[PDB]
C-alpha cells in the first residue's frame, strides 16, 4: 500500500519492519521498498533545503551629467 502526517504513517511502517524481523522479509519486495524510500529521502532533503531558505572605488569612471 505504501509503495503505491505521512511520517506518523512511516514511523508506523518502521515499527512494522522491526516487528516483521530480518528473517521474514522477502528480497523482491525489499527492493521495491528500498527504491521507494530512496525517492522519499531525496524529496525530504530537497524540502529541508527549501525550508531553511525561507527562514533565511574605481580610479576612473565615465558618467553622463544631468542638466
Amino acid at each position: 500500500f505504501i509503495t503505491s502526517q505521512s511520517t506518523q504513517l512511516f514511523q508506523l511502517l518502521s515499527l512494522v519492519l522491526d516487528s516483521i524481523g530480518l528473517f521474514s522479509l522477502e528480497g523482491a519486495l525489499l527492493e521495491n521498498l528500498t527504491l521507494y524510500i530512496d525517492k522519499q529521502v531525496e524529496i525530504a532533503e530537497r524540502n529541508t533545503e527549501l525550508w531553511n531558505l525561507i527562514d533565511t572605488l574605481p580610479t576612473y569612471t565615465m558618467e553622463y551629467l544631468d542638466i
Binding site: 518502521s14 519492519l17 522491526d18
Partner: protein, 152 residues
C-alpha cells in the same frame, strides 16, 4: 625586622583581614572582564591555544550576547583565523553547533566583502565541502542507529 615571625601567640586579640589574590587570569578572561569583545575573540585563535579553551571563549561571548559585536570591525585579514578554526571545528561534535552559529553570523554580516575578496571565497568553498561531509556522517549515523534499534 626581628619580629616578622611572631604570629601573636601571646596576645589578647588576633585580627586577620588579608585576602589572597585570585589565581592568575588568562588573556581572554581579562578581555572579557574588561568588556573587550573583539580582542577576546582574537585571543581564541592564537597559536598553541587549547581547543577546549578556545571553545569556552566562543561560548562565553555567545552567552554574553556578543557575537555580532565581536565581528564588526573585521576584514578578510582578521577573519581567516576564525574561519580556519571553524574549518576544523565543524568536524568535532561538541563544537559543531557553536561553529554553525558563528559561521551563520559572519555570512550575514560580510556577504558584500566576500564578493570582492577572493581568499574569503575559497575558505567558504572548502567549508561547504566539509560541512557537506559532516552531513553524510550524520546521515550515516542515523542509519546505524536505525539498524541498532532493529536488533534490539
Amino acid at each position: 625586622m626581628r619580629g616578622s615571625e611572631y604570629q601573636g601567640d601571646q596576645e589578647h586579640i588576633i585580627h586577620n583581614d588579608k585576602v589572597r589574590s585570585q589565581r592568575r587570569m588568562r588573556a581572554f578572561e581579562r578581555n572579557i572582564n574588561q568588556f573587550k569583545w573583539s580582542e577576546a575573540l582574537d585571543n581564541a585563535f592564537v597559536p598553541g591555544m587549547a581547543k577546549e579553551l578556545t571553545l569556552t571563549v566562543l561560548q562565553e561571548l555567545r552567552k554574553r550576547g556578543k557575537v555580532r559585536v565581536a565581528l564588526y570591525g573585521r576584514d578578510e585579514s582578521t577573519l581567516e583565523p576564525l574561519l580556519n578554526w571553524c574549518l576544523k571545528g565543524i568536524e568535532d561534535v561538541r563544537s559543531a553547533s557553536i561553529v554553525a552559529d558563528w559561521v551563520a553570523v559572519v555570512l550575514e554580516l560580510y556577504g558584500n566583502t566576500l564578493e570582492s575578496s577572493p581568499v574569503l571565497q575559497e575558505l567558504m568553498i572548502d567549508l561547504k565541502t566539509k560541512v557537506r561531509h559532516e552531513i553524510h556522517k550524520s546521515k550515516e549515523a542515523q542509519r546505524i542507529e536505525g539498524m541498532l534499534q532493529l536488533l534490539t
